[PDB]
Amino acid sequence: AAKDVKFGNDARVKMLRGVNVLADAVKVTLGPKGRNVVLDKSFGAPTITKDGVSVAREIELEDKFENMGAQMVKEVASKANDAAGDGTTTATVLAQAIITEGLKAVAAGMNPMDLKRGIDKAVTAAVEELKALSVPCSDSKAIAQVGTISANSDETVGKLIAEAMDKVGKEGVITVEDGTGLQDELDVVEGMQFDRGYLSPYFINKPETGAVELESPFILLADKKISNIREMLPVLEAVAKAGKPLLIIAEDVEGEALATLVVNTMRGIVKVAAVKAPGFGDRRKAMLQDIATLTGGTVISEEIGMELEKATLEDLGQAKRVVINKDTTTIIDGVGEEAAIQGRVAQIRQQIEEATSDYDREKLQERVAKLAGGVAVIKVGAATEVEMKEKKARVEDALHATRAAVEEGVVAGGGVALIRVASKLADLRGQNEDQNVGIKVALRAMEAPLRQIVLNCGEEPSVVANTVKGGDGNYGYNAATEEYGNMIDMGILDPTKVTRSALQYAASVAGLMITTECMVTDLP
Amino acid sequence: AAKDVKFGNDARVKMLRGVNVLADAVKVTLGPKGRNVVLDKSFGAPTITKDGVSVAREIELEDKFENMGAQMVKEVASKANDAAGDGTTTATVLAQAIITEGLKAVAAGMNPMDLKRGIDKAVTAAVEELKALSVPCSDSKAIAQVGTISANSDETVGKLIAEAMDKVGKEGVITVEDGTGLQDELDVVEGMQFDRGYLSPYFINKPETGAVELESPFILLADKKISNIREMLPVLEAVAKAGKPLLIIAEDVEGEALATLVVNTMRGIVKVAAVKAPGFGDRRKAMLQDIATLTGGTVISEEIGMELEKATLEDLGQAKRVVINKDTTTIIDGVGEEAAIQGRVAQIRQQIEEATSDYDREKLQERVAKLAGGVAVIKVGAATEVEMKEKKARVEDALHATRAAVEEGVVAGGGVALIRVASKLADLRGQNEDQNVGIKVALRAMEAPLRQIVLNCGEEPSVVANTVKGGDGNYGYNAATEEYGNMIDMGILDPTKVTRSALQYAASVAGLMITTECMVTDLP
Amino acid sequence: AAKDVKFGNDARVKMLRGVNVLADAVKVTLGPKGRNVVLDKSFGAPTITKDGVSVAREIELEDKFENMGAQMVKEVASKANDAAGDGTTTATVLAQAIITEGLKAVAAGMNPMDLKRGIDKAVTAAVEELKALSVPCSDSKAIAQVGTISANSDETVGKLIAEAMDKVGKEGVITVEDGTGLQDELDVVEGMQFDRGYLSPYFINKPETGAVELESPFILLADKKISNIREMLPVLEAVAKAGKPLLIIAEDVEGEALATLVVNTMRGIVKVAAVKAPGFGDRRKAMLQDIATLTGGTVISEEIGMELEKATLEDLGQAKRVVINKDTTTIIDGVGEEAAIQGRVAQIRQQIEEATSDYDREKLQERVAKLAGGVAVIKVGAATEVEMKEKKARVEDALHATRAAVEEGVVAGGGVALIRVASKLADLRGQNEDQNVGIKVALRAMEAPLRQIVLNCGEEPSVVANTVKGGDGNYGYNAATEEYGNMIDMGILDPTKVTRSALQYAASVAGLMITTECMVTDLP
Ligand SMILES: Nc1ncnc2c1ncn2[C@@H]1O[C@H](COP(=O)(O)OP(=O)(O)OP(=O)(O)O)[C@@H](O)[C@H]1O
Ligand SMILES: Nc1ncnc2c1ncn2[C@@H]1O[C@H](COP(=O)(O)OP(=O)(O)OP(=O)(O)O)[C@@H](O)[C@H]1O
Ligand SMILES: Nc1ncnc2c1ncn2[C@@H]1O[C@H](COP(=O)(O)OP(=O)(O)OP(=O)(O)O)[C@@H](O)[C@H]1O
Ligand SMILES: [K+]
Ligand SMILES: [K+]
Ligand SMILES: [K+]
Ligand SMILES: [Mg+2]
Ligand SMILES: [Mg+2]
Ligand SMILES: [Mg+2]
C-alpha cells in the first residue's frame, strides 16, 4: 500500500506526543495516592485497575505516527512487567522522562547516537549504583513491607505473602486465586497432592465425607493401563497376605478390574483404592517417578523389562497416609530415602536451569515443591467482581515485589534510591560533550519517579525532590504520610530488581528512539 | 483496464520524483553519523533499523508514476543487498546521483542511449580502477575494522566476527542469532554434530545432566528402518564380544528394538545408544556417507546389495567420542582417513560449484564444515527487542562486509576510493560528445557517497569532497572523527565487492531508465 | 445492455483518435534513436522495453469508441509480430499513415470502399516491388548486419546469431535464454541429447564429476515399463558375454531391476546404466524411433509382436559415446545408417509441412536437429533484471530479423526501400479516380517509416525523405549516423518479409476501417 513518510522533527514530535499520552494515562496510578483507571471492555463490564502495564496495554491512538510512538513506549512497561512484575508505572515514567530529555537534546541539532551512548553509560552506572545500594530482604518484616508498598499500602497482603513463604519455604510454590467470602485466606499443603480422585465411590470407607482413607498402604505405580484382573492376581494375593491397604496409581482401571476391586473391598478381602496417574505423557512418567522416590517404590512399566504379573511387594511403594476424595489424592509421608528424593529434585532443578519456557519452569518447581517444598493457595475475598480484580492485581504485584526483594534485596522506595544514584553519578562523562549531554539526560531522568509519586499526592514534586536531594542515604519523602524520613525504617522498600529492570528497559527503548530521523507508515 | 499514458518530460520528472523520495528516505542512514528509521508494522510494534535496503523496501507512493520510479530505483538497493549484503545506502545514493545527472543531460534534448553508453563505459572503468585499488583483507585486524565500519562503528561486532572466522576457519560456517542476556557470545563447534538426541532417556548413563556418553564406540549407520531385533542379533553379539559401546545412527528404531536395547544397557550386556539419522531423503544419505567417511565405516543400506544381518564389525564405524543429549549427537574424532574425507568434501565443493540455490550451497558448505571446518554461533544480547533487531542487523551487515573484504580485499572507506577513481577517470571519452556527457555524469555521480556521509554528519559535503580530491591515495575525511587522514590508517575499510557491485547496479538501472520516453500505467 | 451508437464523422474521428494515441505510444521506439518505454506491471517491477508490439499491447483507452479504435489498430502490430517478429513499430506507423490518409480522403466525399480497393491495389504492387527489390541474405556478414539493425545497433547480438547459425546449421534450432553473468554466451550441441539422467547415483563410474560414462555401449530402447529382472536376464547375459557397457533407455526401471543392475555394476560384471525414455506418449515413441535410427537398433515394444526376453544383441542399439549426468543423457555418434536417419527426418519434415501449431513444428524441428542438425543456447548476461528483459527482447528481435532475412533476403533499411517502391509506383491507377485516390493514399503512406525514424533522431523527416527520394536504389539516410549513403554498404539491412508483412497487415486493417460508417458499443 502507499506509504506516508515523515522526516526529522515531525516524526520526533509524533513520538513525543504518543509517549506523553501513554505516560499520562499510566502515571496517574503511580505512588500511594495514585488513583485508579477503568478500562472499557467490549465483552463484559469495565475493569478497575491500578497496574501501570494494564493501563499502558490498552492505549492506541488514531494518528499512525503517534500510534507508533505509543507502541514503542509501551515496550518499556511490557518488559518491566515481564521481568519483575512491578514498577511498570515507574518504568513508564522513567521512559517518558528519558524520551523528553533526549528529544529536547536532539532538537539542538546535536548527534543522537552519542546521546544514546551517554544515556546507556549513565544507566549502566545507575544499575551498578543500585546493585551496590541494594540491601538484602530476607526477614519476614521486610517481605511484608515490600508487599504492602506494592499492594498500594495494604499490610494484609504483605503479611499473607510473608506467611505463605514462611510456611511453604523457599522451594515451594505460592499462587493467588479468587475467594468465595469477603476476606483473604491461605492454605498450605505439604507432600504430594495430585488432582486424582477415587475411581469408584464404593472405595469410600467413610460415607460421612465421601473419602477413601488408607493407613500405611502399599502403592502400585502402574505406568500402564490395567485392563484384566489376571495381570494383578499375584500382587492382590501378596497384599491380602500382607493385609495392608493398597493404592493403585495407574493410567486408568477398566470395568472388570474396578468391579473386582470394589467387590473385594466390601467382601473384606483387600482394602484397595484405585486412582489415575497424575500428568499426561512424559510429565506423567516424571510424576510417577517422583511418587516412587518419595514412597520408595518401583514404577510398573513395560519399557524397562518387567511385567505387572512379575511385580512383587518390593515394587510396591509404601506411605504413611493416603487421602482420597472425589477429586484429589494426597500421599503423606511416603517411605522415601532422602538420597533419591534429593537426587530427583536436583535433576528437576537442572532441567529448570535448562528450561526456557516459564510454564515448564513453574511445573518443575511445583514438582520440587511436591517432593520437598509446599503449595500455598491465597484466596482473595471481597464483595464485588471489580474488587476481585483490583485486589487480586494488588496481591499479585505485592507477590512479585516480595519475590524480587527476596532474590535481589531492597532499596529506598519512592524514587529516593534513584535520587541518591543521580547524586552519586553527577560526575560521569562520556566520550564527548554529546555523551555528557546524554548522561545528564539520564541523570535528570531518573529523578522522575519520586516527582510523579508526589504529584499524584498533590504536593510539590520539585520541593520534595530538592529536599530529598539535600538529604542522603534513605532520607526521602513518604508520599502516603507526606513526611520526610527514612524510607527503610518506615517500610518504604522497593525491590532492586524492579527499579533496575525498569530503568534498563526505559533506557534501551529511549536511546534507540533518540536516533530516529524518519518514519514510513501506512496512509490514513 | 484503461491506461494512463505519459510522454517525455512529465514522465522523467515523475521518475526523478520517485527516485528522490526513495533516496531521501534511504540516505539518512548513510555514514557513521547517519540516523536510523522507524518503520511502522501492521502486525507488531514499529521496527527501528539502519539498513538502507530495509528502508528502501518499505517505500511505496500513491502516485503510480512516482510509484514506478520508486520501484525501479529500489532495484539498485535490492541487488546491492543481494550481491554483497552491504553498501545498499551507498548504492541508492549513487543511483540517485546518476539518475539526476542523466535526466538533467536528457533535459537538453540529447540522445539518451549515448548517456547510457558513456555511463556504462565510465562505470566499467571505475570497476577496473576499484579492483586495481583493492588491497587484500586477510589479517584479523582488517576484518575487525571492516566489521566495525559496517556495524556503524562497533568494534565488538568486528572483533567477534574476526574471532569466529579465526576459530572456525575459512571453510566453516558462521551464523548470527539472538541471545538471551545483555551481551553477545560466540560458540564454536569443531567436528561433526547433528541435531539428533537419544531415542530413550534410559540410554542416559549420567542422570545428573541427562546425557549419553560413548567412549571409543562402534557406529552402525543404518540407511534403513530397524524394526525387529532379529536383524541385529549378529551385530549385537559382535559388540558384546568386543565389549565397546555402540551408537546406532538409524532412520528410526521401533518399540521392540528400543526396549531390548534399553534393557540390555541396564542389564550390563551392551552399552548401546540409538539416535536418528540426520537429514531427510538424499541429504540424509549424503550425511550418512559423511559420517561413514569421518568414522571409517560402511552405511547399511539395501540399495547396495548387503543386509543388516550380514553386517559385521568392519561395516561399523568407529569414533573416539560420542556425545548425546536430549537434542544433539556429536561424533568427535571419528577414525576417518583424510583421503576419504577430503574426497567427500571435494565432491561437496564440486556440487557447490554446480549449486544455483543459495540454500543448497549453504547446506553443502555446512556439510564441509562438519567434515572439515567448524560451526560458529553468535548470540546478540541486549535489553529490548528493537535493540535485538537493530544490533542483529548491524552484526549481519558487518559479517557480510567482512566476508566481502576477505574474498575481494578492501579500499579506503567513506567514498574516498570513488573520488580517487573519478580523479583517475577524468580523461575518459566516449564515441561522441554525448557519450562524454554520460561519462561526466558518472564521474560527477560517484562522488556522492562521501558527500552524503558528511551531510549525515552535519558538515560540508562540498568542502570535504574538495579537500579529499586535493588529497591522494587513501587521504579522506573520517566522518565519525570529522578529521582528514588516510582511511586505511584508522580502520575505515570498505569491501571492494560492496562498492563495485553497488556502482554496477546503480549504473545498470539508471542507464536503462534514462532512455525512457513513455509511461503506460493504470488509471488512479 | 443498452448500446451507444455513432454515425459518420464522429465515429471516424474516434477511430483516428484511438489510432493516433496507440501509434504515438508505439512510434517513440522506432529507428536507431528510438526511445524506451516503461510499462507498469501490477505483479512485479515495471518493464523497460523497446519492442513496438509490446507497447501496443498495453494500450487501453477509457473512451469505448477510442478504445475499440485502439483495439483495431493494435491488430497491425500483433499480426506483424506474429508473422516475422520484427517491424511492429514500422507496421504501426504505416497503419497510422494509411488510416490518416484514408480518413482525410473520406472526409472529402470519398467512397470508402474505393479507397480500400485502391489501397489494396497499391499495397499489392508495393509487395511485388519489395519482392523484386529483395536481395538474398546468406552471408554471415549480412546476417550479423541484420541482427545489429534489429537489436537497436548491437553488433554483438548479430555476430552471436550468425555464429549460432553457422555452427548449428540451417536445420538446427537456436534459442535465447537469460544468463548468469554480465555477458552473453553461446553453447552448441551436436548429436542427440535428452533431459534424462541416470536412475541411480551408484551408476556413476566417475564420482569426481558425478557422471556415467559409457564407451561403445549397447543401447536397449524399451518402449515399455520394465519391472522384474527376469525380463533382462537374456540380454544381461548377452551383454556380459559381449563385455561392453549397456545403456537402457526405458520408460522407467523399478526397484528390483535397478538394485540388481547397480549391484552388478560395482561387482565388475556388467557396466549397466539406466535412463528414462525422453518424451511422453506418441512423442516418446517417435523419439525412441529416432534413437533407434541413429544408433542402429530396435525399440523394444509389445505392440509389434516381440518381447524383451526375446530381445538379442541385434535389437540393441550401439553408439560410440554415452554421457549421463544428474539431468541429461547424450548419445554421441550412434551407429546409424544415413538412409534411415534421412528417411526419419524426411518423415518429420513431412509432418512439419502438415503441422499447423507452431509448437508441434518447433518440436519436430528440434527432433530433426537432434538427428541431423544441432542445438544452440544463447544466454544473455547483464547486471540487472530490466536489462535482462530489454537485452533479451533485442536479441529475439535480431534473431527474428536474421531468420526472415535468411529465408527471404534483405532490402534497404530505414524505410529507404519503401521510398523507392513509392517512386516506382507513382504511376499506378485504379478502376476510377476514386481508386486512384486510394493508390495515392497508400503512396503517401509508405514513406512514413523513414520519416518517423528520422523524427526519433530529432532531424527533419521531410528534408530527409526528400533527399532520399532524390536518390535512387539504396541511397538513403543513416539515422544512427545521420548521414546520407548506401544502406546496404553500411549494414542497414531490413528483412523483406518484415516490411512486406507489416505493409500487408497495415493495409488490410486500414482499408476495412475506412469503409466504416456506424459504431455500436456499450454505454459508459
Ligand atoms: N508511602 C510511600 N512513600 C513514598 N513512596 C511510596 C510509598 N508507597 C509507595 N511508594 C512508591 O510508589 C510506587 C508504588 O506505586 P504502584 O505500586 O502503584 O506502582 P509501581 O510500583 O510503579 O508498579 P505497578 O504499576 O506494577 O504496580 C513505588 O515507586 C514506591 O516506591
Ligand atoms: N569513520 C568513518 N569515516 C568516514 N566514512 C565512514 C566512517 N564509517 C563509515 N563510513 C562510511 O559510511 C558508510 C557506512 O554506512 P552504513 O554502514 O550505515 O551503510 P552502507 O555501508 O552504505 O550499507 P548498509 O545500508 O547495507 O548498512 C560507508 O560508505 C563507509 O565507507
Ligand atoms: N542506422 C540506421 N539508419 C537508418 N535506419 C535505421 C538504422 N538502424 C535501424 N534503422 C531502421 O529503424 C527500424 C528499426 O527500429 P526498431 O528495431 O526499434 O523497430 P522495428 O524494426 O520497427 O520493429 P520492432 O518493434 O519489432 O523492434 C527499421 O525500420 C530499420 O530499417
Ligand atoms: K501503578
Ligand atoms: K545504512
Ligand atoms: K521498436
Ligand atoms: Mg508497583
Ligand atoms: Mg553498510
Ligand atoms: Mg525491429
Residue numbers in the entry:
A (entry chain D), B (entry chain E), C (entry chain F): 2 to 525
From the study:
In cells growing at 37 °C, EL–ES1 and EL–ES2 complexes occurred at an approximate ratio of 60:40%. The relative abundance of EL–ES1 and EL–ES2 complexes in tomograms was about 55% and 45%, respectively, similar to growth without MetK overexpression. EL+ cells grew essentially as wild-type (WT) but contained only free GroEL (EL complex) and EL–ES1 (around 90% and 10% of total GroEL, respectively) and no EL–ES2 complexes. The in situ structure of EL–ES2 at the given resolution showed no major deviations from the crystal structure of the non-cycling symmetrical complex with bound ADP–BeFx (PDB 4PKO33). At 37 °C growth, the relative proportions of these species were largely independent of MetK overexpression, with a subset of EL–ES2 complexes containing structured SP in both chambers. In WT cells, EL–ES2 complexes are also functional.
